Design a protein around this ligand. Structure first.
Ligand code: Q7G
Ligand code: POV
Ligand code: POV
Ligand code: PEV
Ligand code: PEV
Ligand code: PEV
Ligand SMILES: *[C@@H]1O[C@H](CO)[C@@H](O[C@@H]2O[C@H](CO)[C@@H](O)[C@H](O)[C@H]2NC(C)=O)[C@H](O)[C@H]1NC(C)=O
Ligand code: CLR
Ligand code: CLR
Ligand code: PLM
Ligand code: PLM
Ligand code: PLM
Ligand code: PLM
Ligand code: PLM
Ligand code: PLM
Ligand code: PLM
Ligand code: PLM
Ligand code: NAG
Ligand code: NAG
Ligand code: NAG
Ligand code: NAG
Ligand code: NAG
Lengths: 162, 1111
């Protein structure tokens, strides 16, 4: 089962970050030969790669040597990559450029599907905006419901006792 | 012309005719002909026997001719229609045999007709055929109405699906058996499938692989027989859908080519045809049967014996596979002990009641037979083999029936109606035998001649009509449904023009006979003031409505928990908080009810206990999301929709009624369980351990038995070849596997696989060989006859009896409706039995030259109706491959009909001075006109995205719904629609309950069987990935449309093909496997529950029909 979902663009200093990347085939009966490449770009960078899968995981010297991890699938249908101890400086553009080719005994289609990730780590990222407003909604609704119950209890007590 | 009733020749001929030796002689000769023409093969004496029989038949013709005369008008030779058949066949044979012509293959076919002579030689069968003809004449209107609706929905299907099954996935950018090639170089083919993969451009339609594009091109699937490209083949598809025959493949094909949103067509077709038209046929036939019937040492020690019998049944149930020596000798010694006990029983009873005394009663004979068989097995078992003697030990389970009051009364009913059941059974057997022989003579040469058309490797297939046994089996399968796959082969070898009539004859006449036998069996078996403040709050009508809204919302929010859950980021948070809100509301309700009523009153109510357990379920679900150890509690929330049961008065009446009708069926259900256990033990005996086979681990097909002669070859790798020795998914290794196999055989899903295994078994380690044990088919035919067909009559008769009883308990026709709905029922009964008698006054003075009369004339209405019918007829001429002239011709016909309906509407608007909008049907016609004009000339100027070419055609067709109106159509159609419109309330309630149960099971299945690898029954359209997919799967299961593929896929773990750790991208759930135990429980429970509710649906509609007809 494959469902494409974008990666989180926010990381917190001192933790690990998962640069999710899901690129999956229209049909899952089909086999392919997948080539995966990850690129990184500082504001002054030139998009140099930091990882790649080609006939197996390769070793690619870069600033990221030694603190990069693989969290993909055997079928190379999820090519997510994890970074350790994200520091304040490392940020910007991460590129999951994936190209695969199929076999059909008559033709060999080629496809490339790019996926880019804007990463901005910060000193302390607080609770995301959506969750906080959702919690406020829950609290106001809970209070209003209990208030409505209290109001009608008082109302009906008055009416009954009279 | 005749001869004198006073003449020596006529007198002697009459003397011979009425002498019973004559009728017996002819009967015996007929049966000899039957055997030696059908069930026997390869004699050398054929000419002598054939000519002797021809002489006997000619003598019969001459005698009966002279005795009766020729054309006295009645009770003469030509008075009896059977004599026409006899004379025709006899003369044809006399001609062919002794004439230059050699219509030889044709001749033998004709001879098969003499099998039907068995009917006029038996007076019981003759009378039965007469009454059957009378009932068939009673079925005329229902047949016509079914034809009407099938034609209408064939038009609807062409409008929606024409050409779709030609969709393929074309490759873009740009030897063997000649009848089994695959154009893999141009279109995409799945690994194993024969036909190109269907695919569509909608997002809810089949998707192409990469480097492929979807273009309509090529041939239809199933050799061209499955398609909606023309009337006729659309009628074929809709008739296959009425019968619900192999429908799941058609569903998959249509929902691949087009979108999954078209499943409404199939749901509506099911409801209208498989449910309602079948209910009408059943009601007509049951009423006809009713009309015909109205026209016509001793004391208190037996506890020891009953315990001994029960323990013997337990010992029988314990034999399985594999088995050691200790657990085998244990069972041997048990057999010894029990047979000794029963021998002593027989001896002592013989002593006490002197010998004639013993055999005066019927149960003593059965017990003596038990002892006699047991001893003659104990001895003689070891030598010579004779393994079938053991197979009769299960007869001892029937001893348990001597103390069973229910088994006795059931057997009593059977025996008391035996006389009438005998004629029906004999007639059905005669028809099956004649049909098998007729089909063999018609199509056996064709099956052998064009064999390569229906089997790669050009060997005869598993189902055919080359010889008589397979002909008999084919007809028997046709009588169970299952007539579509073999019809394709028939037409491939013989042709459309010949197979379709024979198969229709079998289908229709077999259905009539089987339904009549079923009705006969059923009819045989029938014979602090704050406290009061809280009480005020809780009972208020608005509090109930608010809590009901909350229940509905809480239920519906469960449908969002599908594979796309992590993709919907904000919905996830909203739902997580709404769960707490719902919990709070329901806890407040519990506390308020506690305060109002008082714990004793609270827990003393059944429904409030259900509420309380729902509250516990909410709380447990909440606490589960704190520790991954406590995570498994979460799933409990899927019990939540049970709240819907306790909050709505409708669900409560439906559950009450289901309890009142279907609970008293416990004793009969126990009898049926005993029958199934007998058959399961038999099947374990016959088949246990024998379904093992050596297959190719990857390809999965059985190795040819000419190489892997047994297990030792398979297991022992000596030439480094891959080959795995493993069991079958559905086997008979113990009584539990037996029960699963037998359920799979009783619903006819996956039964071909099990019987294929059965008729291929040899020994316990020997490779199975193709159709080497062909007579085991007798096992499954007997099971279907005795542990499926007869139990069904038993159960249904009990349920009908409870229905009628509880109706009498109320003096009210309907029990599935609420009190508020009885007034609705009365109102509907008034409307569809009463004339509107509400005409309008004709404008006179404002505009004299104003002929109101024309519109209200009968002539105008009848011309309008004929126009509707012609519009419908002109639709049938459309096809997929069509000329350019025909296309424009049909376009202009539709345009002219739009024009003519517009003229109708305008003239009516003139006639009624603004009362036109008072009548609801007039609004329907007005909307039809407006939408038709819109669509017809919407692409004239606006040039919208597009107007589908068939949209205007379909819009115009809706007006034919006018044929079901009292004044504007045949009077029968209204009468045959009355039951639906009178049972609409109860049907609504039951359908809502069915939807609720389906919803619960869909949510549970979403939780369980998503992420299970896609295999036989799990594919793109039917799976448990979303709510719609799961509901499609459950609907498919409810009609028995292939639930065996679903379970076969869920059993992937049994088959050792799944990765318990594969990452599923975009979801935190890991794994690819299923739980077979959960799968079995799931499907068995759903099958039982859905069956019970649907059967009650049928009972409701049929009882309503009977009530209406009773007036
Ligand atoms: C796609 C395209 C579109 C365009 C188009 O093509 C397709 O569309 C297509 C649609 C085609 C029409 C379809 C239909 C008809 C009707 C047919 O002829 C009447 C149909 C016959 C069928 O009758 C049976 O009806 C039931 C069927 O199950 C049988 O079952 C009973 O079985 C038990 C035993 O009796 C009962 O106890 C159960 O209760 C009961 O179920 C019943 O025995 C049997 O007789 C005769 O009809 C009777 O119907 C009533 C029954 O006798 C009677 O009514 C009475 O009603 C009151 C009685 O209570 C009395 O007081 C009233 O005086 C009295 O009127 C009356 O005798 C008479 O009307 C004439 C041809 C036509 C116009 C077709 C022409 C071409 C089309 C227009 C096509 C066209 C080309
Ligand atoms: C030629 C035979 O062609 C024939 O001989 C056909 C004979 C027509 C008789 C019609 C029988 C209908 C039986 C109605 C059933 C009534 C059952 C009564 C219900 C109990 C060879 O076939 P081909 O080579 O494929 O061309
Ligand atoms: C707290 C108090 C609760 C009390 C509630 C009790 C209420 C229940 C009362 C009544 C319920 C009775 C309804 C039965 C309807 C079945 C219809 C059917 O099957 O279709 C066919 C008819 O089939 C038959 O002839 C009937 C026999 C069904 C047996 C199925 C067993 C499968 C188990 C397999 C186990 C595998 C084990 C594998 C182990 C390795 C026709 O189509
Ligand atoms: C006093 C009031 C009287 C009122 C009576 C009203 C009765 C109304 C009935 C109420 C609703 C009934 C529900 C529907 C009953 C019809 C069911 C049936 O006929 O048999 C079913 C049971 O299934 C069968 O296998 C029956 C097939 C018959 C096989 C022929 C056996 C006949 C045995 C007689 C001996 C003949 C000798 C032949 C030798 C081989 C068929 O299954 P299905 O088509 O509904 O769905 C299955 C799809 N997977
Ligand atoms: C097989 C090729 C057919 C392909 C083309 C189809 C052409 C349209 C045929 C239209 C026939 C019109 C009558 C339709 C009534 C169908 C009855 C029916 O199937 O519904 C139920 C009601 O049917 C009955 O119980 C009684 C039917 C009696 C009517 C038949 C009268 C006999 C006609 C005698 C002449 C024979 C005609 C031979 C043609 C030369 C039983 O179905 P089932 O659910 O049990 O199917 C089991 C598979 N799940
Ligand atoms: C006794 C009843 C008599 C009633 C007779 C008339 C009843 C209605 C006839 C069916 C009208 C359905 C309208 C659907 C529009 C025409 C189909 C179509 O092709 O247009 C689009 C259809 O798309 C849709 O709107 C979704 C399909 C809706 C399916 C509706 C099936 C229901 C039919 C049952 C009618 C009876 C209803 C009974 C209610 C209980 C797609 O266009 P396309 O084929 O050129 O290519 C699209 C892909 N690129
Ligand atoms: C699915 O959509 C594609 C859209 O391109 C259709 O292919 C084109 O159809 C048009 C006619 O409408 C042709 O003139 C083009 O040459 C086709 N090719 C393409 C890729 O443009 C295709 O026919 C549609 N298929 C189905 C079965 O609906
Ligand atoms: C309430 C709304 C939302 C849902 C409506 C869908 C209805 C019409 C669907 C869902 C389940 C279906 C039923 C499932 C099983 C069978 C058995 C077979 O003999 C045909 C009729 C019958 C009985 C179907 C009739 C139509 C049905 C009731
Ligand atoms: C399942 C679908 C596709 C088919 C069902 C069509 C039925 C329900 C339609 C077609 C014919 C209709 C009836 C025709 C006649 C009248 C007269 C007037 O008093 C209005 C109601 C009434 C009584 C209609 C009720 C609904 C009706 C019975
Ligand atoms: C072509 C094969 C014919 C199959 C049907 C048998 C035809 C013979 C006549 C059957 C009906 C006879 C009964 C007439 C009415 C009655 O007696 O009640
Ligand atoms: C009253 C029953 C009549 C049944 C008649 C309908 C027969 C259904 C099959 C018709 C298919 C027509 C074949 C046309 C030629 C072809 O396209 O190969
Ligand atoms: C197998 C089933 C065997 C049943 C044995 C026969 C039962 C005895 C018949 C009872 C008739 C009434 C009576 O005298 O009790
Ligand atoms: C009465 C049944 C008629 C059936 C005729 C089938 C026609 C198919 C020919 C293609
Ligand atoms: C896991 C099992 C699911 C099914 C549970 C169904 C519970 C139904 C409860 C029925 C209570 C009956 C009370 C009737 C009271 C009355 O009729 O007055
Ligand atoms: C209540 C009735 C039950 C009757 C059950 C009948 C089961 C019949 C089984 C037939 C077995 C045929 C075996 C053929 C011999 C062989 O092995 O070659
Ligand atoms: C060959 C196609 C003809 C189509 C026209 C058929 C006539 C219109 C349909 C309405 C039938 C009217 C019957 C009313 C009387 C009755 O049957 O009780
Ligand atoms: C939208 C939620 C769907 C949940 C699935 C189960 C649907 C069953 C709901 C039953 C409601 C019955 C309404 C009764 C009408 C009334 O208020 O009188
Ligand atoms: C990536 O894989 C490693 C090793 O299996 C594991 O320890 C780590 O937690 C994984 N990270 C994620 C985010 O799955
Ligand atoms: C990250 O690196 C800094 C500097 O070496 C170290 O102090 C800190 O503990 C590290 N954190 C992790 C995630 O290992
Ligand atoms: C980030 O950039 C600054 C300036 O370019 C550099 O001093 C620093 O070393 C970089 N990252 C870290 C924190 O190592
Ligand atoms: C992938 O290709 C290169 C790799 O850097 C670059 O253009 C970019 O990252 C991606 N764009 C394309 C062409 O897919
Ligand atoms: C399997 O078949 C072979 C060849 O007939 C035979 O020699 C062998 O004994 C058989 N297996 C067993 C163990 O019976």
């Amino acid at each position: 089962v494959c469902v494409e979902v974008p990666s989180e663009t926010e990381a917190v200093q001192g933790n690990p970050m998962k640069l999710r990347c899901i690129s999956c085939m229209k049909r899952e009966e089909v086999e392919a030969t997948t080539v995966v490449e990850w690129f990184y770009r500082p504001e002054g960078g030139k998009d140099f790669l930091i990882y790649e899968y080609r006939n197996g995981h390769q070793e690619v010297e870069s600033p990221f040597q030694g603190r990069l991890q693989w969290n993909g699938s055997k079928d190379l249908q999820d090519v997510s990559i994890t970074v350790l101890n994200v520091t304040l400086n490392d940020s910007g553009l991460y590129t999951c450029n994936v190209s695969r080719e199929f076999e059909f005994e008559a033709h060999r289609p080629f496809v490339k599907t790019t996926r880019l990730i804007p990463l901005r780590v910060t000193e302390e990222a607080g609770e995301d905006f959506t969750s906080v407003v959702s919690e406020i909604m829950m609290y106001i609704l809970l209070v209003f419901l209990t208030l409505w119950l209290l109001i009608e209890m008082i109302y009906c007590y008055r009416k009954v006792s009279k | 012309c005749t001869l004198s009733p006073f003449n020596c020749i006529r007198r002697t001929t009459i003397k011979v005719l009425v002498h019973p030796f004559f009728q017996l002689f002819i009967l015996i000769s007929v049966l000899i002909d039957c055997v030696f023409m059908s069930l026997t093969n390869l004699p050398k004496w054929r000419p002598v026997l054939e000519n002797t029989l021809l002489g006997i038949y000619t003598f019969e013709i001459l005698v009966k001719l002279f005795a009766r005369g020729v054309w006295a008008g009645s009770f003469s030779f030509l008075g009896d229609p059977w004599n026409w058949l006899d004379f025709s066949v006899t003369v044809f044979e006399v001609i062919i045999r002794y004439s230059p012509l050699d219509f030889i293959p044709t001749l033998q076919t004709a001879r098969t007709l003499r099998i039907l002579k068995i009917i006029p030689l038996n007076q019981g069968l003759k009378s039965l055929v007469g009454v059957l003809i009378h009932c068939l004449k009673q079925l005329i209107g229902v047949i016509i109405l079914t034809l009407f609706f099938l034609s209408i929905f064939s038009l609807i299907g062409m409008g929606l699906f024409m050409g779709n099954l030609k969709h393929k996935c074309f490759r873009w950018p740009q030897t063997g058996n000649p009848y089994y090639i695959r154009e893999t170089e141009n279109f995409y083919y799945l690994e194993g499938e024969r036909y190109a993969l269907l695919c569509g451009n909608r997002t809810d339609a089949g998707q192409c692989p990469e480097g492929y594009v979807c273009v309509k091109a090529g041939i239809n699937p199933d050799q061209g027989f499955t398609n909606f490209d023309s009337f006729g083949w659309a009628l074929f598809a809709l008739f296959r859908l009425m019968a619900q025959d192999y429908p799941e493949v058609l569903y998959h094909q249509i929902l691949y080519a087009s979108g999954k949103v078209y499943m409404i067509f199939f749901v509506v077709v099911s409801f209208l045809f498989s449910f309602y038209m079948a209910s009408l046929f059943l009601g007509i036939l049951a009423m006809a049967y009713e009309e015909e019937k109205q026209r016509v040492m001793a004391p208190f020690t037996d506890l020891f014996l009953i315990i001994c019998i029960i323990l013997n049944v337990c010992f029988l149930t314990l034999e399985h596979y594999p088995m050691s020596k200790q657990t085998n000798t244990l069972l041997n010694i048990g057999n010894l002990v029990f047979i000794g006990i029963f021998t002593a029983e027989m001896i002592f009873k013989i002593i006490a009641m002197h010998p004639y005394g013993y055999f005066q009663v019927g149960w003593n004979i059965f017990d003596s037979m038990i002892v006699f068989h047991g001893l003659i097995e104990l001895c003689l078992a070891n030598v010579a083999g004779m393994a079938l003697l053991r197979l009769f030990r299960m007869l001892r389970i029937f001893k348990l029936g001597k103390y069973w009051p229910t088994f006795q009364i059931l057997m009593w009913s059977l025996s008391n109606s035996w006389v009438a059941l005998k004629d029906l059974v004999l007639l059905l057997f005669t028809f099956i035998f004649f049909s098998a022989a007729f089909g063999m003579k018609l199509f056996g040469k064709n099956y052998e001649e064009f064999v390569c058309h229906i089997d790669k490797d050009c060997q005869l297939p598993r189902w055919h009509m080359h010889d008589f046994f397979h002909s008999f089996l084919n007809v028997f399968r046709i009588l169970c449904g299952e007539w579509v796959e073999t019809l394709w082969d028939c037409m491939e070898v013989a042709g459309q023009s010949w197979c379709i009539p024979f198969y229709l004859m079998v289908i229709l006449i077999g259905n009539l006979l089987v339904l009549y036998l079923f009705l006969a069996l059923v009819s045989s078996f029938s014979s602090q003031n704050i406290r009061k403040t809280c009480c005020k709050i809780v009972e208020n009508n608005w509090f109930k409505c608010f809590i009901g809204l909350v229940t509905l919302l809480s239920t519906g929010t469960l449908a969002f928990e599908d594979i796309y859950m992590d993709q919907r980021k904000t919905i996830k948070i909203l739902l997580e908080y709404a769960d707490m809100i719902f919990t709070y509301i329901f806890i407040l309700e519990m506390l308020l009810k506690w305060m109002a009523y008082g714990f004793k009153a609270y827990f003393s109510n059944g429904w409030y206990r259900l509420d309380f357990v729902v509250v516990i379920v909410f709380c447990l679900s909440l606490i589960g999301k704190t520790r991954e150890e406590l995570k498994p509690l979460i799933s409990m929330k899927f019990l939540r929709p049970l709240r819907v049961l306790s909050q709505f008065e409708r669900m409560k009446v439906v559950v009450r009624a289901l309890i009142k009708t279907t609970l008293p069926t416990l004793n009969v259900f126990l009898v049926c369980l005993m029958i199934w256990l007998i058959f399961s033990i038999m099947g374990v005996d016959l088949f246990a351990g024998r379904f093992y086979e050596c297959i190719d681990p990857t390809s999965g097909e059985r190795f040819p038995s000419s190489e892997v002669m047994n297990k030792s070859r398979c297991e022992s790798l000596l030439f480094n070849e891959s080959m795995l020795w493993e069991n079958a998914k559905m086997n008979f290794d113990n009584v539990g596997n037996g029960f699963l196999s037998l359920l799979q055989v009783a619903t006819f899903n996956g039964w071909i696989t099990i019987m294929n295994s059965a008729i291929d078994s040899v020994a316990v380690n020997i490779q199975p060989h193709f159709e080497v044990n062909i007579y085991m088919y007798c096992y499954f035919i007997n099971f279907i006859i005795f542990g499926v067909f007869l139990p069904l009559s038993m159960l249904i008769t009990v349920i009908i009896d409870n229905f009628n009883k509880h109706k009498i308990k109320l003096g009210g026709s309907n029990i599935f409706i609420t009190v508020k709905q009885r007034k609705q029922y009365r109102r509907l009964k008034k409307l569809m039995y009463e004339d509107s008698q509400r005409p309008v006054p004709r404008p006179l003075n404002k505009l004299q030259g104003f002929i109101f009369d024309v519109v209200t004339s009968q002539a105008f209405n009848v011309i309008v109706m004929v126009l509707i019918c012609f519009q419908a007829i002109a639709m049938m001429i459309d096809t997929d491959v069509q000329s350019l002239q025909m296309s424009i011709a049909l376009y202009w016909i539709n345009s002219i009909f739009v024009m003519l309906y517009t003229m109708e509407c305008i003239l009516k608007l003139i006639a009624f001075r603004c009362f036109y909008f008072t009548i609801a049907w007039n609004i329907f016609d007005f909307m039809v006109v407006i939408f038709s004009i819109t669509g017809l000339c919407l692409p004239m100027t606006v040039g919208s995205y597009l107007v589908p070419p068939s949209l205007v055609q379909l819009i115009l067709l809706s007006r034919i719904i006018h044929m079901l109106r009292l004044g504007k159509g045949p009077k029968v159609f209204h009468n045959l629609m009355l039951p639906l419109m009178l049972s609409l309330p109860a049907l609504l309630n039951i359908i809502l309950l069915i939807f609720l149960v389906m919803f619960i099971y869909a949510v549970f299945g979403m939780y369980n069987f998503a992420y299970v690898k896609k295999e036989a029954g799990i594919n793109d359209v039917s799976n448990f990935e979303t709510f719609g997919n799961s509901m499609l799967c459950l609907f498919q299961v409810a009609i028995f449309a292939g639930w065996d593929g679903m379970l076969d896929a869920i059993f992937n773990s049994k088959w050792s093909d799944c990765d318990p750790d594969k990452i599923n991208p975009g979801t935190q759930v890991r794994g690819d496997c299923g739980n077979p135990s959960v799968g079995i429980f799931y499907f068995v429970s759903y099958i039982l529950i859905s069956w019970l509710i649907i059967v009650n649906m049928y009972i409701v509609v049929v009882m309503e029909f009977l009530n209406i007809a009773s007036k």
